[PDB]
Amino acid sequence: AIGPVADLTISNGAVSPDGFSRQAILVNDVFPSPLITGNKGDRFQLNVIDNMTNHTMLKSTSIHWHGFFQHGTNWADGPAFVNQCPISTGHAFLYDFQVPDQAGTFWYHSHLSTQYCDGLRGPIVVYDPNDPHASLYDVDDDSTVITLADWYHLAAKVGAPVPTADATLINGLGRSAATLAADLAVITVTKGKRYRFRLVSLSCDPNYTFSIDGHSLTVIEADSVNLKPHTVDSLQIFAAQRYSFVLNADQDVDNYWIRALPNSGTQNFAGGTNSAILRYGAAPVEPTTSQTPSTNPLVESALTTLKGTAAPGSPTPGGVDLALNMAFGFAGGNFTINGASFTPPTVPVLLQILSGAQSAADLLPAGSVYSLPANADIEISLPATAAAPGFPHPFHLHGHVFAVVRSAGSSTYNYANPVYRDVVSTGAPGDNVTIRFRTDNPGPWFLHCHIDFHLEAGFAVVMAEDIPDVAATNPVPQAWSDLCPTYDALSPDDQ
Numbered sequence: 001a002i003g004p005v006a007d008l009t010i011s012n013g014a015v016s017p018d019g020f021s022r023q024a025i026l027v028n029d030v031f032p033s034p035l036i037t038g039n040k041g042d043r044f045q046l047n048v049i050d051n052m053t054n055h056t057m058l059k060s061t062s063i064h065w066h067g068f069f070q071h072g073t074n075w076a077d078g079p080a081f082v083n084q085c086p087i088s089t090g091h092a093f094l095y096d097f098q099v100p101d102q103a104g105t106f107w108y109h110s111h112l113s114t115q116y117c118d119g120l121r122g123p124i125v126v127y128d129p130n131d132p133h134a135s136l137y138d139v140d141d142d143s144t145v146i147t148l149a150d151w152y153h154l155a156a157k158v159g160a161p162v163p164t165a166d167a168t169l170i171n172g173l174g175r176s177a178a179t180l181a182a183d184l185a186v187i188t189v190t191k192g193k194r195y196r197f198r199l200v201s202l203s204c205d206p207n208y209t210f211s212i213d214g215h216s217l218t219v220i221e222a223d224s225v226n227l228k229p230h231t232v233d234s235l236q237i238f239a240a241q242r243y244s245f246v247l248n249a250d251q252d253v254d255n256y257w258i259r260a261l262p263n264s265g266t267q268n269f270a271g272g273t274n275s276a277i278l279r280y281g282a283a284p285v286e287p288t289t290s291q292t293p294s295t296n297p298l299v300e301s302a303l304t305t306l307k308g309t310a311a312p313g314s315p316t317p318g319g320v321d322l323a324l325n326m327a328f329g330f331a332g333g334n335f336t337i338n339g340a341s342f343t344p345p346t347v348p349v350l351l352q353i354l355s356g357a358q359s360a361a362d363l364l365p366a367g368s369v370y371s372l373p374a375n376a377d378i379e380i381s382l383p384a385t386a387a388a389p390g391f392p393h394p395f396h397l398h399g400h401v402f403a404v405v406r407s408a409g410s411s412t413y414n415y416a417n418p419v420y421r422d423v424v425s426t427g428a429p430g431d432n433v434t435i436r437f438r439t440d441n442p443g444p445w446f447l448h449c450h451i452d453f454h455l456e457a458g459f460a461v462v463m464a465e466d467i468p469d470v471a472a473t474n475p476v477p478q479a480w481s482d483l484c485p486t487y488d489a490l491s492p493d494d495q
């Protein structure tokens with residue numbers, strides 16, 4: 001509804017998405033954060049005005065525009081102390097980037113510590129006027145965006161270091177155990193019409209098993225990548241993933257439960273928990289529909305891209321320029337990858353590079369940075385392990401889409417027409433989720449666990465892609481160059 005040129009004013013205030021009042025983060029004076037829209041190829045100019053006054057939730061901020069490649073604008077990507085120093089309170093900062101060659105469903109969120117769980121997270125849609133799937137539906141608009149989120153009665157820094165959610169919010173509304181009368185979200189449809197629903201996980205932690213009673217879902221886009229249509233009766237969506245699906249409103253006029261079962265916390269629907277309403281003329285009451293067993297669940301390995309794009313490289317293990325293996329571990333309240341835990345360096349990784357760092361051994365933090373050759377194919381395997389609790393861990397690679405040559409719960413490799421996405425579950429112990437991508441994008445890019453409570457615990461690495469070309473490819477605006485001095489002048493209590 002706003003965008004692609006717009007102000008985003010960040011402030012604190014009370015919210016009660018589940019009928020419980022708590023302090024949170026507001027964006028343009030609303031919770032949940034508003035939807036931003038634009039079209040394929042557009043210039044986005046989003047002026048993030050930081051007016052937050054609460055240090056427990058951090059007065060500083062940084063926004064990541066999730067899914068966008070940010071080619072030439074690595075400075076605008078969002079990660080605190082990788083791509084910028086945070087915006088300090090009482091200051092504004094403009095993210096000015098372009099979206100060539102990308103269309104689909106995205107989201108924005110704070111990429112500073114675990115701040116996005118406190119409410120700074122909203123959907124984004126980039127419309128394609130020549131969408132390959134335009135003819136599959138009649139309605140695609142603001143009312144067809146569906147967001148899922150985890151919600152906590154105690155703030156990120158206040159509750160447990162890995163808290164259990166009190167509520168699942170669908171379009172920013174849901175019920176908790178003790179607010180079973182709280183307003184549910186209503187998604188309205190007219191019989192005979194076909195809907196492009198755009199489902200985005202704003203989750204800080206849980207994955208949801210998503211279904212709609214009595215309806216099938218035709219999946220046509222995954223993480224901003226066009227798919228071949230693939231009809232399922234349920235899907236597991238992980239933190240930060242998006243799916244577009246077509247729903248044909250061809251059932252009896254009625255109310256139907258929209259369901260989102262989290263993999264932890266309250267794992268049922270008693271009293272309308274973890275649920276929203278699909279309303280056809282139907283009575284303005286709750287659904288009384290029954291969940292039938294899922295007989296045709298989404299399987300990631302059975303998805304493919306619309307074009308049938310092959311994976312980069314030659315169809316064999318290690319058949320690439322550089323293959324890397326990320327071994328997960330956990331020691332001392334810290335997650336590790338190849339023995340190293342991520343602690344945000346004081347000089348942002350991009351700034352280190354611009355300032356003359358030439359290699360990964362130069363780059364801080366030590367052991368957390370990987371140099372990547374220019375214009376190459378890369379293969380990364382992320383084998384799951386019990387040695388890193390709270391699996392399955394979804395990983396996200398910034399500045400890039402990747403081929404999922406191997407998925408969780410699959411034994412097979414697919415080099416010929418694998419799905420392409422940007423957030424992938426690494427699965428349960430025994431899996432070896434494996435991805436490949438092209439180094440077509442000079443700059444430092446976070447690769448990390450998108451469960452945010454684990455990202456605090458350092459479950460992250462940085463891909464330092466084409467170091468020699470980072471400065472030339474990524475000219476930075478003077479406002480970017482003023483972020484660090486301004487942030488370093490702040491006292492800890494104002495951070």
Ligand SMILES: *[C@@H]1O[C@H](CO)[C@@H](O[C@@H]2O[C@H](CO)[C@@H](O)[C@H](O)[C@H]2NC(C)=O)[C@H](O)[C@H]1NC(C)=O
Pocket residue numbers: 022023024054055056057153154155158159
């Ligand atoms: C700033 O935000 C924090 C974190 O949300 C608020 O923390 C609350 O602290 C009170 C009083 O100590 C507790 O009873 C609440 O349970 C906390 N809320 C949450 C969500 O954890 C704090 O109130 C905020 N500061 C101001 C001035 O509003």
Ligand SMILES: *[C@@H]1O[C@H](CO)[C@@H](O[C@@H]2O[C@H](CO)[C@@H](O)[C@H](O)[C@H]2NC(C)=O)[C@H](O)[C@H]1NC(C)=O
Pocket residue numbers: 317318323324325381383430431432
């Ligand atoms: C997960 O997959 C990776 C990549 O195939 C495996 O790493 C390779 O292991 C073989 C045999 O030990 C070696 O030839 C290579 O050096 C490894 N490739 C690297 C490091 O890039 C890894 O062992 C697999 N893990 C599990 C648990 O199956």
Ligand SMILES: OC[C@H]1O[C@@H](O)[C@@H](O)[C@@H](O)[C@@H]1O
Pocket residue numbers: none
């Ligand atoms: O920090 C949480 C605190 O919040 C207060 O409002 C009360 O609910 C206390 O029981 C609790 O200790």
Ligand SMILES: [Cu+2]
Pocket residue numbers: 064066109240396450
């Ligand atoms: Cu993200």
Ligand SMILES: [Cu+2]
Pocket residue numbers: 390392393394449450451454459
């Ligand atoms: Cu994790």
Ligand SMILES: [Cu+2]
Pocket residue numbers: 064079111396398446448
């Ligand atoms: Cu990230």
